[PDB]
């Protein structure tokens, strides 16, 4: 009956307990800090061989090998220093929308409109590549997948859920609920102990892999969120949405600090990533080009225009020497 | 300049070679996307041919391989995955003719038709319309007239007229009548032409595309 009241009142407390913890307006704190200026990058490599749109990519921890997934029914592995193909995995479902590369390097994963996360083993005798598990139990469509170790993996689905599995059996060890919309983005933390999800109800949520409870909920957007990434300190993240706007959220303050926007930018955002230092945030847009932002002043610092169609995926490597962008034009591009 | 690394290139070339053969082959099939009103005819249309998310149906007719994608078991935000099909050869759209009396359904079917035909991704994609269940439409006329659905309908309450009125009220919903065509068909139980019609329409589409490629449209 009156249960729909205490919540509202209760919510009004939060809206006030995070307005007294706001005094600095970071854009003011970092007013004297020396700017970065302007950043020029150049296409060093171009990786050809895909016959359709590529919908995702992922780097390896060696900072040399990467994997890409396309809707031609192909998952290709590349040496980036030569442009040589190490493996080409043919899938059963051409409708793939995500990919991952295990930290060790023995496994990859894929998924999409079939509602199944398929794990593939690369380092096996017989000199082939075999599917080891087909994790099923979702009802939507796989929108992201991330490894914790070689026997654990987190998944997000368009059924308003996320899940933590156990690959040896193939059963959900935990199921994360609370969203009211298709979930579209994931980011794990450095410690691989608490992760963050970004949904189409214009919200983000911070989970806790150990228990299964949402510790904090973040709002502020005016449309669907499609991308999210963690700051390297593990104490902040960034979100990209269809309102042509990125935002930075802090966990402890439980607010947002900076918004990254521009009047002459009206397209949506498909991807987000940081730099090894956490000083320049990269973003992939639908206007066919990527942009670079100074994440302490909100100014721009550079543009990456080499693609003849949407930038769907964007990644940065753990050593910090390169960026890789993917496009619907069936091309990946390395920048330095 | 190199080493046994040479053998790592001779490999990357045996890979780049099979991707071609996979694309020089997946380009001679025809991909179709199947949509329809809520549980109207999207099922019987498949059984008319004799061969968990998306359902792929592969079949063949006169040395031409068709792949039909049925995605009704995918209840989600369609705005987020309906661009995976941009580049599909055609859209089959199945609507019924016994759905005006029932409940109102023809109106939402037309809403979906207008939401699909006039989409950013299907500005060039042709549509094959199947108006099905005409046998029963013959009976739901005598008892119930048509004006119960379309007030502005002022004409002979008969098959050869109401069917054409529905056809027109469906076909006058494409705003870009100059870039895509709409093919329409009333289904026959036996004498399986429901697939010869698809064959004709598809070959017409293919010719109309080859002629645009050759710059002498």
């Amino acid at each position, epitope marked *: 009956d009156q249960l729909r009241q205490e919540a509202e009142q209760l919510k009004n407390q939060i809206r006030d307990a995070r307005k007294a913890c706001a005094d600095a307006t970071l854009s003011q704190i970092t007013n004297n800090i020396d700017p970065v200026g302007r950043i020029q990058m150049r296409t060093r490599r171009t990786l050809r061989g895909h016959l359709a749109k590529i919908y995702a990519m992922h780097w390896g921890t060696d900072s040399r090998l990467l994997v890409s997934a396309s809707q031609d029914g192909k998952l290709i592995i590349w040496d980036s220093y030569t442009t040589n193909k190490v493996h080409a995995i043919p899938l059963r479902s051409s409708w793939v929308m995500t990919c991952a590369y295990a930290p060790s390097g023995n496994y990859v994963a894929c998924g999409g409109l079939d509602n199944i996360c398929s794990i593939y083993n690369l380092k096996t*005798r*017989e*000199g*082939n590549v075999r599917v080891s598990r087909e994790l099923a139990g979702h009802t939507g469509y796989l929108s992201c997948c991330r490894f914790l170790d070689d026997n654990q993996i987190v998944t997000s689905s368009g059924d308003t859920t996320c899940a933590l599995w156990d690959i040896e059996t193939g059963q959900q060890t935990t199921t994360f609920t609370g969203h009211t919309g298709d979930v579209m983005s994931l980011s794990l933390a450095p410690d691989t102990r608490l992760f963050v999800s970004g949904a189409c109800d214009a919200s983000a949520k911070l989970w806790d892999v150990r228990e299964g409870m949402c510790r904090q909920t973040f709002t502020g957007h005016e449309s669907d969120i499609n991308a999210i990434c963690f700051f390297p300190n593990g104490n902040a993240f960034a979100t990209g949405s269809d309102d042509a706007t990125c935002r930075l959220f802090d966990l402890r303050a439980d607010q947002e600090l900076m918004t990254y926007s521009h009047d002459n930018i009206i397209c949506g955002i498909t991807s987000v990533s940081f730099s090894k230092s956490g000083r320049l945030l990269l973003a992939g847009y639908d206007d066919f080009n990527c942009n670079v932002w100074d994440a302490l002043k909100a100014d721009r610092a550079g543009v990456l225009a080499g693609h003849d169609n949407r930038v769907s995926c964007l990644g940065v490597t753990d050593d910090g020497m390169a960026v890789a962008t993917g496009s619907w034009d069936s091309f990946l591009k390395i920048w330095n | 300049l190199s080493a046994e690394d040479k*053998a790592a290139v001779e490999r990357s070339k*045996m890979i780049d070679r099979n991707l071609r053969e996979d694309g020089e082959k997946a380009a001679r099939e025809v991909k179709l996307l199947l949509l329809g009103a809520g549980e109207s005819g999207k099922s019987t249309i498949v059984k008319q041919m004799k061969i968990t998310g998306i359902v792929e149906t592969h079949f063949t007719f006169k040395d031409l391989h068709f792949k039909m994608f049925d995605v009704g078991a995918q209840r989600s935000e369609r705005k987020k995955w309906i661009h995976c099909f941009e580049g599909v050869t055609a859209i089959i759209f199945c609507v019924a003719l016994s759905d005006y009396d029932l409940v109102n359904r023809m109106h939402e079917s037309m809403k979906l038709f207008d939401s699909i035909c006039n989409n950013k991704w299907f500005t060039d994609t042709s549509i094959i319309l199947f108006l099905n269940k005409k046998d029963l439409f013959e009976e739901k006329i005598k008892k119930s007239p048509l004006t119960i659905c379309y007030p502005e309908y002022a004409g002979s309450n008969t098959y050869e007229e109401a069917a054409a009125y529905i056809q027109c009220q469906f076909e006058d919903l494409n705003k870009r009548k100059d870039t895509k065509e709409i093919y329409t068909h009333f289904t026959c139980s036996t004498d399986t032409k429901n697939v010869q019609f698809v064959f004709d329409a598809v070959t017409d589409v293919i010719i109309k595309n080859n002629l645009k490629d050759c710059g002498l449209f």
Partner: single-chain antibody
Framework: VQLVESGGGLVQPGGSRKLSCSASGFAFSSFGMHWVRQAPEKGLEWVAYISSGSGTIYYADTVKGRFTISRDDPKNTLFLQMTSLRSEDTAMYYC??????????????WGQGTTLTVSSSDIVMTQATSSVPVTPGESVSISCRSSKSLLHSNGNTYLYWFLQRPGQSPQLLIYRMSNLASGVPDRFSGSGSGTAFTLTISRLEAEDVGVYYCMQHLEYPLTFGAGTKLEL
């Protein structure tokens, strides 16, 4: 995984022969294939190599013109045709698999061999020592010397360490002077810098006694060492 060779027996000088290697348990088509020899009381010498796709072949300067290597992939078989046999060809022949991509372990599986006997600008890898007695429990080291730096511009150092036990076939221990194969304990370690390399064995144990061999994969032809024996 399996590799069975056949086609060897007593023949006469001037004759001809054909040896066959049947594979069972792996993707024969994705693997390049080698033939290797071992004379009765001597070391290992290389013979021929054919790639995946067969669009690349290499012979030694001792058999060119009178040998021919081929492969039938549909039937998973490797062939060596030999003409004009001399007494310098009595040996045990071994069929070897090798796959090349970033991070691969070539020369990983060998066969059991065919014993043939007929009636009566290259790198030089040197293994000074030829015999070493030891006791189970202590540590050991073995040294290899090359007449040319094996390090390359890409950063890789192409040296391979093999082990042959009494009455068995060789077995890859180490590839590229630092990497350890799949199926060998951590006792074995590799080290060194161009023109000199070292293998270290700690907390020794039985079954580690036999003949150790050095190999280079920098440029064809390929070359082995004389073989360092390690017994009790």
């Amino acid at each position: 995984v399996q590799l069975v060779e056949s086609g060897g027996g007593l023949v006469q000088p001037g004759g001809s022969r054909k040896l066959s290697c049947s594979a069972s348990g792996f993707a024969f088509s994705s693997f390049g294939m080698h033939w290797v020899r071992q004379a009765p009381e001597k070391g290992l010498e290389w013979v021929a190599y054919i790639s995946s796709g067969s669009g690349t072949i290499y012979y030694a300067d001792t058999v060119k013109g009178r040998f021919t290597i081929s492969r039938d992939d549909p039937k998973n078989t490797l062939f060596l045709q030999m003409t004009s046999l001399r007494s310098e060809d009595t040996a045990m022949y071994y069929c070897v698999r090798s796959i090349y991509y970033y991070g691969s372990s070539p020369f990983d599986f060998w066969g059991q061999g065919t014993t043939l006997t007929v009636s009566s600008s290259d790198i030089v890898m040197t293994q000074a020592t030829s015999s070493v007695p030891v006791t189970p429990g202590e540590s050991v080291s073995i040294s290899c010397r090359s007449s040319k730096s094996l390090l390359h511009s890409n950063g890789n150092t192409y040296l391979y360490w093999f082990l042959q036990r009494p009455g068995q076939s060789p077995q890859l221990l180490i590839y590229r002077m630092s990497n350890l194969a799949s199926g060998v304990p951590d006792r074995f370690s590799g080290s060194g810098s161009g023109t000199a390399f070292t293998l270290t064995i700690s907390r020794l144990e039985a079954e580690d006694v036999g003949v150790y061999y050095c190999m280079q994969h920098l440029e064809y032809p390929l070359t082995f060492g004389a073989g360092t024996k390690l017994e009790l």
